[PDB]
Point group: none
Chain length 26, copies 3
């Protein structure tokens, strides 16, 4: 047969995680 095709593109980068919780009272 023909040779295999080229490797696929790298996946999309993941989104940044959510903001952290509000800090404690001071």
């Amino acid at each position: 047969p023909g040779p295999p095709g080229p490797p696929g593109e790298k996946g999309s980068p993941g989104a940044q995680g959510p903001p952290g919780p509000p800090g404690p009272p001071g």
Copy 2:
């Protein structure tokens, strides 16, 4: 002879979402 090269591979899976950020500072 051999045929032409195959089609491109599938795009990779998306990366995971990052973790939650740190707790904020004290008031």
Copy 3:
């Protein structure tokens, strides 16, 4: 000949970065 088979699946994307710090308390 038959055309070649598809290429291998791409690598996964990188995990996203950690989130921003939360607001002050």
